[PDB]
Structures are given as C-alpha cells and as structure tokens.
Amino acid sequence: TELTDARRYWVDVTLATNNISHAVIAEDKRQVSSRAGTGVLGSQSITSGKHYWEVDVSKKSAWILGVCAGFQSDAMYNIEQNENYQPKYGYWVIGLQEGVKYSVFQDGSSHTPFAPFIVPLSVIICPDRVGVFVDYEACTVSFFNITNHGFLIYKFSQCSFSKPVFPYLNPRKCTVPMTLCSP
C-alpha cells in the first residue's frame, strides 16, 4: 500500500561513472560491484586433455599461481579478499611471500572456513620461472621449478575437475610484473 503508492513514481535510474570510486559500473550503467584482489585468469577454459604453460616470476617478492575454476565462489568465502585459496573452492595454487617464503594452499577445517591451510614448501633454488601442468583427465596439477632443472615443486592429485578450469596468476601486491613465456 505504502509501497504500491511509492511505485507510482518509479523512475529509470542509471549510474554515473565517477573518478573518486574504485567501484566498477557495468556498460549499461545499471549494475555496480566491487573489485577484490589481483587474481586473473587465462582466457581459455580447460575441460579436457593436457596443458602446459610457464610463468616468469623474476625479481618478484610475492605471487600466487596455478589453476582456478573461476571467481564464482569468491564472495561466499571472501577468497580473493582474504587469500582463502582452497581446492574445495576451486583453487589449486602455490604462492610466494616476503621474497623467500613459498607455500602450497590446501583445504582448511570447515570449522574455520574463511582461512586456508597453508603448508610451507621447501625451496632451495628460488624459481625465476615456474612451469604449470594440468592433466585434466588424470585430475592433477603439477608445478615445476624451471630454474632448478625442472624438478617438481608440488603436485595436486585427485583434483575435483567437475567444472572448467583456467590458468590462474596473481601478482600479489608485488609491483614487478609476472609474464607468460612462449611457446
């Protein structure tokens, strides 16, 4: 009734782009959202077969890289915002922080679902370049230390590949670029 009366004055609101906000306004100016983190995906989904690529992380003091099933579940567990990367949320990633601290991101307790279980990696020869290998049929994601004779850094097995997955890169507040090498 009060609402019904109010609706008589329904107007067509569109948003103004401004240059004071970090807000992201859709092309049609009828939708707005926030940005979270600095994670980016490859442009082509992987839903079959074997895929290899290499990421140059020379001189970077921090990063996250691996494979991601997308940002669909980012909001519910505040993933990018709190670096809550877990296989159960569609992330198979390793990371570096503070120049020398390498870790793998694993599933954490559901009793504390907003924080992952971070496991230190033993890295002796710091990688300038990391190879990432997805075998979608086998459900594995492998990380190779190109700088260290290509020795395996870590391998995720029995991955829950029920959805398309993508290369995942995150420069993680470190201003040094990370680069996809060719081929």
Alpha-carbon distances, residue 4 vs 8, 11, 12, 13, 83 (angstroms) = 7, 14, 17, 19, 44
| 96 close to 126: Cβ distance less than 8 angstroms | no
Q: How was this structure determined?
A: X-ray
Number of separate domains in the chain = 1
What is the bridge-based pairing of β-strands 63-68 and 91-97? antiparallel
Resolution in A: 1.5
Rounded CA gap, 48 and 14, in Å? 42
Beta strands 91-97 and 101-106: pairing type? antiparallel
- For the chain, the first-to-last Cα distance in angstroms comes to 65
SS3 of residue 8 by DSSP: helix
SS3 94: strand
C-alpha 176/C-alpha 183 separation (Å) is 22
Q: Residue 80: give its domain's CATH number.
A: 2.60.120.920
Q: Encoding tokens for residue 37?
A: 């983190």
Cα–Cα separations (whole angstroms), residue 36 to 17, 29, 33, 96, 172 = 19, 20, 10, 19, 12
What is the extent of the structural domain holding 117?
1-183
